Design an enzyme around this catalytic site. Structure first.
Site, PDB file in Angstrom:
ATOM      1  N   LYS A   1     -11.130  -7.632 -10.326  1.00 28.22           N
ATOM      2  CA  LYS A   1     -10.863  -6.643  -9.385  1.00 28.22           C
ATOM      3  C   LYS A   1     -10.412  -5.459  -9.818  1.00 28.22           C
ATOM      4  O   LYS A   1     -11.014  -4.509  -9.090  1.00 28.22           O
ATOM      5  CB  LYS A   1      -9.771  -7.402  -8.538  1.00 28.22           C
ATOM      6  CG  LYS A   1      -9.072  -6.714  -7.392  1.00 28.22           C
ATOM      7  CD  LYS A   1     -10.432  -6.360  -6.276  1.00 28.22           C
ATOM      8  CE  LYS A   1      -9.953  -5.392  -5.004  1.00 28.22           C
ATOM      9  NZ  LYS A   1     -10.810  -5.068  -4.108  1.00 28.22           N
TER      10      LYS A   1
ATOM     11  N   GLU B   1      -6.552   2.987  -4.932  1.00 26.07           N
ATOM     12  CA  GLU B   1      -7.038   1.602  -4.570  1.00 26.07           C
ATOM     13  C   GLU B   1      -6.000   0.968  -5.376  1.00 26.07           C
ATOM     14  O   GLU B   1      -5.791   0.858  -6.235  1.00 26.07           O
ATOM     15  CB  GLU B   1      -8.475   1.353  -4.903  1.00 26.07           C
ATOM     16  CG  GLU B   1      -9.325   2.050  -4.065  1.00 26.07           C
ATOM     17  CD  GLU B   1      -9.556   1.210  -2.659  1.00 26.07           C
ATOM     18  OE1 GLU B   1     -10.075   2.165  -1.608  1.00 26.07           O
ATOM     19  OE2 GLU B   1      -9.347  -0.037  -2.489  1.00 26.07           O
TER      20      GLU B   1
ATOM     21  N   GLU C   1       0.891  -1.170   0.188  1.00 20.75           N
ATOM     22  CA  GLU C   1       0.091  -0.055  -0.002  1.00 20.75           C
ATOM     23  C   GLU C   1       0.765   1.192  -0.164  1.00 20.75           C
ATOM     24  O   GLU C   1       0.545   2.081  -0.900  1.00 20.75           O
ATOM     25  CB  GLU C   1      -0.847  -0.128   1.371  1.00 20.75           C
ATOM     26  CG  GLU C   1      -2.047  -1.040   1.455  1.00 20.75           C
ATOM     27  CD  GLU C   1      -2.414  -1.048   2.499  1.00 20.75           C
ATOM     28  OE1 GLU C   1      -2.695  -0.325   3.335  1.00 20.75           O
ATOM     29  OE2 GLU C   1      -2.850  -2.486   2.833  1.00 20.75           O
TER      30      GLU C   1
ATOM     31  N   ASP D   1      -6.583   3.486   0.156  1.00 14.95           N
ATOM     32  CA  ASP D   1      -5.114   3.210   0.330  1.00 14.95           C
ATOM     33  C   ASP D   1      -4.202   4.280   0.390  1.00 14.95           C
ATOM     34  O   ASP D   1      -3.413   4.239   1.217  1.00 14.95           O
ATOM     35  CB  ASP D   1      -4.708   2.007  -0.382  1.00 14.95           C
ATOM     36  CG  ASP D   1      -5.397   0.775  -0.379  1.00 14.95           C
ATOM     37  OD1 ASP D   1      -5.541   0.063   0.814  1.00 14.95           O
ATOM     38  OD2 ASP D   1      -6.141   0.064  -1.440  1.00 14.95           O
TER      39      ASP D   1
END
Ligand SMILES: [Cl-]
Ligand code: NA
Lengths: 189, 192
Positions: free
Chosen positions: A115, A102, A51, A89
């Protein structure tokens, strides 16, 4: 199991880069004595690495304290009604524009695309809501194929994952012992 | 000595408050395996506890990354030429006033007063320089007699110090054992 925990400890301390944003999660990980807790905190540690790495690469601030979009805007003095609980994130409020990040990791192209579209749609749902409040959404979806990041060498990342898996098979063993589960559930009925 | 290291690690993780400003030094301490390094990093850990505690009690920001006064002003958009390299333990620019903190621990009244006057004079030397730039110096010197801080219970602070002392005792006895060796002769005859 204690040897695995000790190995994961030394990799955390010696082969995870000394970035300040990782300090809290390293300490949470190092404080764990129970195998399933070492596992959870270990997964969270590896995820934070990714992240942070994704926030740096996207030119925005890593969401250190898991603030929601509403919370992010409120702190900068922007009022936003009825907006879904989205915890990015990464983020960066620059002028009238809100960068929202993200990131994810998918191992198969099929799961990667699926996704990517989910993450894209998740951020897109607050576009019009933000624009009413004078905020221009700048949505970034960072899709990755592997768990590698700039805080760990490739071998260390691999060995950290190999050790966490060994810790999971000791935990999934306890999940299989639940042949005893069928007896005590039947002892009630 | 491995048991002492293990005990100190346990106290660090369980009885040193989970303030994020302590996280880096806790990790540096926890990563040490060599008794002399555990000792140094342990002392530095106890010192950061005191510096942070002193900043909180003085109503200002702890100087986490050891920034200089010049650097502190520059970040807030203030230009200041001639300025000695002063790195405070704490600081706060509020309005037109610059709070600068210096803390210390001295065990004897003689060393306490001497250090208080040194710290006072150190901050005072930039008074006129700062004013010539429109900023009013608010200099704080926080003198302490002990290592008491809000991040550790009294018993834990005491036990941490008792264990670090046992480590000092072991580590200086290994210096004595080493000083009897021939590597120490190559070590002393190292100038060059
Ligand atoms: Cl000092
Ligand atoms: Na000092």
């Amino acid at each position: 199991h204690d040897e695995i925990i000790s190995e994961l400890r030394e990799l955390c301390l010696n082969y995870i880069e000394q970035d300040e944003r990782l300090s809290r999660q390293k300490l949470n990980f190092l404080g764990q004595r129970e195998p399933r807790m070492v596992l959870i905190e270990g997964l969270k540690l590896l995820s934070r690495c990714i992240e942070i790495d994704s926030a740096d690469k996207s030119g925005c601030t890593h969401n250190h304290d898991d603030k929601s979009v509403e919370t992010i805007l409120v702190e900068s003095g922007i009022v936003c009604p009825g907006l879904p609980l989205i915890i990015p994130d990464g983020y960066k409020l620059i002028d009238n524009s809100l960068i929202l990040l993200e990131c994810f990791v998918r191992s198969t192209p099929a799961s990667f695309e699926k996704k990517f579209i989910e993450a894209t749609n998740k951020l897109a749902c607050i576009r019009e809501d933000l624009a009413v409040a004078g905020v221009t959404l700048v949505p970034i979806v960072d899709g990755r194929c592997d768990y590698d990041n700039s805080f760990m060498p490739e071998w260390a990342n691999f060995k950290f994952r190999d050790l966490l898996f060994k810790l999971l098979e000791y935990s999934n063993q306890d999940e299989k012992v639940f042949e005893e589960s069928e007896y005590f559930r039947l002892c009630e009925s």
